[PDB]
A paper describes a structure:
The binary CYPA–compound complex then binds to active RAS (with dissociation constant Kd2) to form a tri-complex structure in which CYPA sterically occludes RAS–effector interactions.
Similar potencies were observed for inhibition of RALGDS, PI3Kα and SOS1 binding to KRAS(G12C), KRAS(G12V) or KRAS(G12D), as well as SOS1 binding to wild-type KRAS. In KRASG12V and KRASG12C cells, inhibition of additional markers, including phosphorylation of RAF, ERK and the ERK substrate RSK, was demonstrated. In these cells, there was evidence of durable pathway suppression and apoptosis induction after 48 h of treatment, indicated by sustained pERK, pCRAF and pRSK suppression and moderately increased PARP cleavage.
Residue numbers in the entry:
A (entry chain D): 3 to 165
B (entry chain A): 0 to 167
Amino acid sequence: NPTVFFDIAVDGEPLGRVSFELFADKVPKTAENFRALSTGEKGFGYKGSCFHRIIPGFMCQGGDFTRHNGTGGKSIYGEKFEDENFILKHTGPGILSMANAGPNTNGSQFFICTAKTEWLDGKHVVFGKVKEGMNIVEAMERFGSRNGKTSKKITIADCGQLE
Amino acid sequence: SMTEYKLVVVGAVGVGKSALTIQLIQNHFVDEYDPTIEDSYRKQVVIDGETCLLDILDTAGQEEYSAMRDQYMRTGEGFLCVFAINNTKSFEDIHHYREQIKRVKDSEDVPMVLVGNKCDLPSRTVDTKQAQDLARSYGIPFIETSAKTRQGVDDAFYTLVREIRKHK
Ligand SMILES: CCn1c(-c2cc(N3CCN(C4CC4)CC3)cnc2[C@H](C)OC)c2c3cc(ccc31)-c1csc(n1)C[C@H](NC(=O)[C@H]1[C@@H]3COC[C@@H]31)C(=O)N1CCC[C@H](N1)C(=O)OCC(C)(C)C2
Ligand SMILES: Nc1nc2c(ncn2[C@@H]2O[C@H](COP(=O)(O)OP(=O)(O)NP(=O)(O)O)[C@@H](O)[C@H]2O)c(=O)[nH]1
Ligand SMILES: [Mg+2]
């Protein structure tokens, strides 16, 4: 399974690096989309985009690099692509899963769980998990709120694939 | 100070609850889809010559969280029950919202307005006559709206305030 990283910044100040294992063995199409968006090899991707929704006790959501307002994003397969499978569950903190607006609407938005979110099982495609730097994701919660609006700009300052 | 009215906007996902509310508050049409978690707004208005403050709660249509609606139904004074005229399922969902509000309030006499939104669209599947008949059986007003053209937007929120005033 491939590994990717995000270097997180807060109002332009470094916070730290989070790394992810992508479950290409179980969700290869979904893992590949996230991997390519993290390297930027298609000429677009996550670099410079923000975590627009952070809800303490639940998750951190980001990935809208086309509209920068929580409604956008696109995959490497087209604006949206189908749900690959729901094999993996939202079992606890660190799970990496696809955001969507209903069935078969995966784009580039994703979320990282900071707790178990089992009611999302069967509705959101789980495709990876945090490998290193979970404390960075935990540190992002203090910039969130009940309805997810953030109090500082939380950005992916850099991202890429690890050897 | 002016009277404050606590209004709650409910209905199925995508019927236009937020688009209607943002048109009222900000005079702007949201064409993109930004599904709501929870948002609150305030606006002062003049209704029948009396100035008042609208405190509007814009709720999520997500069916997964239907059991979490009780608290805001307890607090709300009046409800805008919104469906989309091109979405028969959203019209069927209305009965479920009214029954939920009736159960939480334990009353048949709750200030409500039925709102048929997206009347600008040519693809109508819910007839005006069906919705008028449903509102009549509930004893509430029915108003057709478009968040895109602003047709009926003020009227729907103003009518809900008039319903609250008549009830209290
Ligand atoms: C009822 C309130 N409420 C809650 C919630 C629920 C709970 N519980 C439920 C579980 N109970 C246990 C069983 C007992 C305990 C109490 C507590 N407190 C809350 C919040 C804090 O009260 C304000 C939520 C929640 C979620 C939504 C709407 C309302 C919600 C909602 C709207 S849109 C969406 N969900 C999916 C969304 N879609 C888009 O963003 C589309 C945008 C357009 O196209 C691309 C992009 C998406 O993919 N994600 C990625 C996945 C996490 C998800 N967002 C999100 O934010 O979940 C937030 C949250 C807090 C996890 C859930
Ligand atoms: N043509 C037209 N489109 C509308 C109208 N009202 C809303 N829409 C569109 O319908 C979509 C959903 O609207 P939105 O207000 O977000 O719906 P909501 O009921 O608040 N959804 P949620 O429950 O997820 O928060 C958006 O693309 C919006 O532009 C309307 O009167 N006419
Ligand atoms: Mg909304």
